[PDB]
């Protein structure tokens, strides 16, 4: 993992050096009032959305749920088979029943 830190810091250093040299190599012109303006098509110029927030919340709940589906590949050769099967079938079946119930309602 210590080599991963060194190579990630080297990628970050190389990208910042490339962008700094690109900013030096960029052609410096006179800065303007209208050039700095945010682009709206043509003529010059959002509230909170709850639907996207519950999309993020559904993503979070399913992400923490996936983080419990993640370990059981390793445990299948090192656990009780009946307990592992009962928990896996119950886990994915309650997930499917909840998904279908939230679809129907």
């Amino acid at each position: 993992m210590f080599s991963i830190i060194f190579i990630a810091l080297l990628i970050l250093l190389i990208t910042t050096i490339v962008m700094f040299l690109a900013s030096i190599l960029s052609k410096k012109a006179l800065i303007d009032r209208e050039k700095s303006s945010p682009f709206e098509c043509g003529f010059d110029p959002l509230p909170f959305s709850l639907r996207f927030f519950l999309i993020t919340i559904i993503f979070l709940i399913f992400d923490v749920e996936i983080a419990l589906i993640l370990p059981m590949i390793i445990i299948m050769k090192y656990s009780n088979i009946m307990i592992w099967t009962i928990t896996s079938i119950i886990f994915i079946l309650i997930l499917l029943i909840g998904l279908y119930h939230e679809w129907n309602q």
Binding site: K27, A29, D32, E34, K35, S37, F39, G42, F43, D44
Partner: protein
């Protein structure tokens, strides 16, 4: 004009070469800046990205250089919708009085170097609505124009001839030599 050279005369003429400056520079620093400017102009003329600015009928011919017969993509030319990512704006259509601040703002948000192609008689000189109450008399009063393509709907060979003339202008750009002489 000049008479184009007869082949008896032109066989005695040497080859022009790629560089408009020539390789006969005196100083080694001047020669190095000349070749760096040649490489920079080759990179700039090797890919100009025009902006999707189609105001009126001329733009129906503008898509006809996108079309498979003429094929602008093998000239470095590919359309970009955002004005930041684009090099060129092709004024292809009729600039009106309500269209003037939109065109000026879109041109001002474009980053420099900025070459402008006026496509069609409404773009340069006003054209067929030159005496109208709500048509700007050419776009040269608002946006500074480098290439002016003449035809009312320019054929697409003539628009691409304007594109090649813009590429010859970009190849003739002198920046580092001017910096050495500034």
């Amino acid at each position: 004009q000049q008479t184009l050279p007869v082949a008896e005369v032109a066989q005695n003429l040497p080859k022009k070469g790629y560089s408009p400056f020539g390789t006969k520079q005196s100083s080694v620093a001047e020669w190095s800046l000349a070749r760096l400017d040649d490489l920079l102009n080759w990179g700039r003329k090797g890919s100009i990205w025009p902006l999707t600015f189609g105001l009126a009928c001329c733009a129906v011919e503008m898509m006809h250089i996108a079309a498979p017969r003429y094929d602008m993509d093998r000239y470095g030319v590919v359309f970009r919708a955002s004005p930041r990512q684009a090099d060129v704006i092709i004024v292809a259509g009729t600039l009106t009085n309500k269209m003037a601040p939109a065109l000026r703002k879109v041109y001002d948000q474009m980053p420099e170097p900025r070459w402008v192609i006026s496509m069609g008689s409404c773009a340069n000189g006003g054209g067929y609505y030159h005496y109208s109450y709500s048509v700007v008399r050419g776009c040269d009063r608002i946006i500074p124009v480098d290439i002016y393509v003449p035809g009312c709907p320019p054929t697409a060979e003539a628009l691409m001839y304007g594109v090649l003339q813009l590429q010859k202008k970009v190849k003739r750009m002198k920046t580092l030599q001017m910096w050495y002489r500034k």
